[PDB]
Amino acid sequence: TALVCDNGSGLVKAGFAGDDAPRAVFPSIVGRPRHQGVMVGMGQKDSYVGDEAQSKRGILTLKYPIEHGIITNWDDMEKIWHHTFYNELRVAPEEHPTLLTEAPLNPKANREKMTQIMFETFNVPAMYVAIQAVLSLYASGRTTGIVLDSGDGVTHNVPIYEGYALPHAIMRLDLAGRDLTDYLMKILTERGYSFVTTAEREIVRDIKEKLCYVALDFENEMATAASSSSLEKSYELPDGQVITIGNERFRCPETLFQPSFIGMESAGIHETTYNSIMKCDIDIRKDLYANNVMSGGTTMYPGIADRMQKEITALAPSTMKIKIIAPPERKYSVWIGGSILASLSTFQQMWITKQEYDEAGPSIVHRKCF
Template sequence: MYSCLDFTYNLKETLRGPRATAATTQREYLTNRCQGPANKLECGFLLTAIEPPSIESPPLAVTARPTNKGVPPRKRTETTSSRSIVRAKRLEMTDSLHNAPIVLDNGSGTIRAGFAGDDLPKCYFPSFVGRPKHLRVLAGALEGEVFIGQKAATELRGLLKIRYPLEHGIVTDWDDMEKIWEYVYGEGLKTLSEEHPVLLTEPPLNPRSNRDTAAQILFETFNVPALYTSIQAVLSLYASGRTTGIVLDSGDGVSHAVPVYEGFAMPSSIRRIDVAGRDVTEYMQMLLRKSGYVFHTSAEKEVVRLIKESVTYVAHDPRKEEKEWANRTDPAKGVEYVLPDGHKLKIGAERFRAPEILFDPEIIGLEYPGVHQIVVDAINRTDLDLRKSLYSNIVLSGGSTLTRGFGDRLLTELQRLAVKDMRIKIFAPPERKYSTWIGGSILAGLSTFRKVGYNLLAYSFPWAQFTAESRG
């Protein structure tokens, strides 16, 4: 009997699944394990015998020993053959490490994927899974239990019950997350996961268990040859061409400020709040309901998100804006938005009230500081000698920072909170919606990238030892 991490297999039973096929004897088990079509030493599992060994072990991560005394000893030529197969698989995996890495920017709201060295991601779509909410009655109807990608986000949206597997940067449904990754490889990139190393992004201060489970799935299910994880904000700084600065990254699930000086990140100075674009969407949905426009299904919530991205803006002075709307001195400020069914919405003060929660989360009852405050707090947690350089290199990243007026309002708030006469400079790259992915493409395209991270052969128990994370 073999113990494979937390799995135990009998030698004489037929094994199913991605880890082994038809292991009726010890010799067949090892041969099939190395020769499987979708197998590159599988997950690099370390197999150990429960009973005393009597056969010489092949090299690398596989140790084979018989458990039945009746099994005849293997000939020298057979052992050499097994060793040759293992060596061949090792060389094959080494070749795959030299293929172009895949950069996987796993955002809470959207997923961006592509090959290292490219200017823009090849695959970009909302990171949700849609399931039909109506009964299929025609034989020629759409087939499939789940729908993912641009088609699900546009044509089929009204037929689906939509669910995001990520909330505030943390995966809450790994089955759906795995389906999204399958779509990325099969339909988006049209490549085999076994042939490319992966750079995976994540927000800072995420639970270690989230990263480890992601690595477990990528190694076991997708058989990726190597994996490296990096903080999203650090990659955004790569994309800006700077080695010193503080990145304010506000996406769909998380907003965070990460200071970096001469290429060194300062983990103790990182500040994060779980207030971002999805919270703005939900607040916009509530404000529209108060105005008489009800959007209650998950598909209609996606319509609200599109409204938010089209018409909202951040007020330079929210109190002044509120007074103007209260006195109705400028009714022309309201805008019309045409719904998919042709109806027109008249949207007024909701345009600036919804994104205001980014600067004042207490509006929706959350005891978080605003995005401007986390920038100042992060800088104040660094040494005195570094603060001047950080204030003059503030880099914006993430889709929520694309809201009109965001940069101007941030500058005003920082000038109010910072030391008098402090020189503050904010950089807002026009491509900041993709900044994290672009930075990952730059990093993974370096010749030294293959030397970092953990590969398939290094994958072993316990889980907490097999993932690599960026230190800066």
């Protein structure tokens, strides 16, 4: 039984290949104690991984091992993988081949150290590394289209024609849900709320997941928000305090379309998608315009499909049919596509086994693997 593990920058989605849903979805954080321990009749650990961190975050400093898609801490990634294999899945990694995910346009040493760690410390019979947007297109039941994959660290625009990603048109924007959480923390200071600690960052993340949305027209929404309090919404804090936000609900996701709100040079996701389409040949542009597929949790705002349709319709020629596919399960779409790919009959001879790694070294992943 193969293992499909999606190590995102904000969540870990792992399970068995063949199931329709992931079995372990937990935050990718390592928490460490911050205060003085005075009681000796207690477990008294030094590192908390996953939900155990989120249940103890008020006395903990939280660290994300992945920052902007690349892995910064490898000991914490080892801890994440150990907790995934032994505590959330209850499996032995010596018996199961493991499928891994990787964002496109990434440094090669990340894949090198990933293969080295997965073959030297958590020894698997075989392993494979796949691109996330290609798997998200595979999970949607199509083989040609453009995938907008926006998660916690990166936003990617990947066009795939006949099951092959087009590497000369892959676009990368360094803006995702972590930057939106930090921008919401910055703009909640206008109403008097202070969020500083890493524990309160999770509270603001919950606020963003609960209350924010995407305005269809930004200037008209800002005009209506400044005319009456029909857009104000209330949120109850963990300590019982009640906060109210009126126009921060749609200003925070507007950084996806206006990235200069946090001071980034790149263009919005609509212009990024139009640039990724326009770098391709003319005879496939109709198929790429007709098959826009959303992916990831940052596309879960309840206004993003209509706004993206309006903006791409504005950018595209007027005789072009624009269709945007936003599946309701797109928070788990890389995992489902990996489950489809790992349960295929001819995929079983594409595994990088341990013998080829012994005969090659930590560079086989650039030749047998994409």
